Amino acid sequence: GSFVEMVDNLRGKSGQGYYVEMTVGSPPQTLNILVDTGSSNFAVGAAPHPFLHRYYQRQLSSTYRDLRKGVYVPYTQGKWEGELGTDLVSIPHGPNVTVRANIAAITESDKFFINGSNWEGILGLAYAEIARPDDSLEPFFDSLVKQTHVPNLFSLQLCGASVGGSMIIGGIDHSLYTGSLWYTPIRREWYYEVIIVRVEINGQDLKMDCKEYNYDKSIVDSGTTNLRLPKKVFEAAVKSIKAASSTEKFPDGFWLGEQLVCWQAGTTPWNIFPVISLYLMGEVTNQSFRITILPQQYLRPVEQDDCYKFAISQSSTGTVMGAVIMEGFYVVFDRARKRIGFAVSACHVHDEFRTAAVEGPFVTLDMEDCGYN
C-alpha cells in the first residue's frame, strides 16, 4: 500500500548514518535512533556524554523495568557499555503501536557517539543471533512483530542527498521504487547475509572465484557508510575502477578513501567513473539478478567546489553493502520470507544519462558454491 506517515521519517548527516525518531518511557522521551541493519541491540544514551545532547532518563519513566544486567559491546574502533532494561517504545512516524522492548541504557562509551550526528541511540534491526550480550536478548523488531499485528518486514529507502529517507515498518511503499523488486535469499538469519554471485565494473567481470565475493560473508548494513569489499575483491575492484576512470588520475590517497577530490560546482565528471554491478543469488534455482550503482553512490559528497570521498573500502570481515549500495535502492527486509528485495529507488542520486538499476534474471549455475563457510 502507501505508508505516508512513515515516508520521510529518516534523517542523517553524510557518513554518520540515518536515524529515525523514537520515544521511550512513560511519559514518552523522544530520541533520534540510528537505523542499523548490521546490529541487533536497541541501545540508547542514558547518561551525559560530550556528543550527546539528550539521553534516556530511566528514573523519569514509570514503565521502566530494570533487568539488573550489564551489557558490554566492544568493537573495532571502540565500545559501548550499558545497563539492560525494558520500557515502552514507540516510533512517532511509524506504525501506531507501542511495544515493551529490551533497551540497553548506554552509560559508558568510546568513539561510539559521533560529534554532530544528532542521534543518541541505535536500533539494531538484524537478528537475535548477533544481539549482545547473547541471543536471548530479543531485538526490537522481534518484539514489535510479536506484540502487534505488524508484518515481519521492513523496508528502507535511504536517499543520501544532510541525508534523508524512509523506514516503512510492516510493509512496502510502491511510491518509493520504480520497476521490479528482485529478491535474494537471506542465507542465514544473523546479519542480513546475502550471496554475491558475480561482480562487474562497467560490465567487465571481476572474474574471481565467487566465494571471494562472500569471504567470509556478505551483508546488507544500513549502519555502514561504505561499500566494503574483501581485500582481494577491493584491490581488483579498485584496479578496474581506476582503469575505467583513467582519463583522470587521482592520488593514491583518494582511492584509500583518505583524500577528497573536488571539481568546480556542477562539473563532476560522473560519466568517466564506472557503474558497479553486484549479482545476487535469486530465489529461483540457477537465477541471479543484478543491482547496479553509480559513482553518485560510491563517491560520497563531503563539505566553492563539489568534493567527494571514495566510499568503497577494504574489509577483513567480508562484503558490506552499506549506504553506498542502499542509497541506489529501495531495500525490503522481508524477514517473513527470509529474503531481501531490491528495486531502484525513486529518490536515488543520478544524472541525466545513468540510473541505478535492478535487472534480472540471469542464468547462474552453482550459486551455492559462492557462499563461504
Ligand X SMILES: Nc1nc2cc(Cl)ccc2n1CCCO
Q: DSSP 3-state assignment of 345? A: strand
Q: Name the closest residue to ligand X (Cβ).
A: 38
CB of 123 to ligand X, least distance (A): 10
Out of 36, 87, 142, 173, pick the active-site residue.
Answer: 36
Stretch that binds ligand X, among 73-81, 140-148, 245-253, 342-350 (CB under 6 A): 73-81
DSSP 8-state secondary structure symbol assigned to residue 133: S
* Residue 103 contacts residue 87 (beta carbons within 8 Å): yes
Whether the ω angle into residue 27 lies within 30 degrees of 0, i.e. cis, is yes
The size of the interface with ligand X (CB under 6 A), counted in residues, is 11
Interacting residue with ligand X among 39, 61, 155, 240 (CB under 6 A): 39
CB of 278 to ligand X, least distance (A): 17
Interacting residue with ligand X among 12, 25, 35, 36 (CB under 6 A): 36
Q: Is 221 a catalytic residue?
A: yes
DSSP 8-state secondary structure symbol assigned to residue 275: P
Cell digits of residue 81: 557499555
Q: Does 224 bind ligand X (CB under 6 A)?
A: yes
Q: How far apart are CA 194 and CA 319, in angstroms?
A: 9
Q: How far apart are CA 169 and CA 144, in angstroms?
A: 10
Residues 6+ apart with CB under 8 A from 291: 182, 277, 278, 280, 325, 328, 329, 342, 356, 357, 358
Q: How far apart are CA 193 and CA 164, in angstroms?
A: 25
State phi, psi for 253 to the nearest 5 degrees.
Answer: -65, -35
Interacting residue with ligand X among 4, 66, 70, 75 (CB under 6 A): 75
CB of 110 to ligand X, least distance (A): 11
Q: Does 40 bind ligand X (CB under 6 A)?
A: no
Site for ligand X in 79-98 (CB under 6 A): 80
Q: Does 193 bind ligand X (CB under 6 A)?
A: no
Instruction: Indicate the helix (H) or strand (E) that contains 301.
Output: strand 299-302
Q: Does 102 bind ligand X (CB under 6 A)?
A: no
Q: Active-site residue numbers?
A: 36, 221
List residues near ligand X by CB under 6 A: 36, 38-39, 73, 75, 80, 221, 223-224, 317, 320
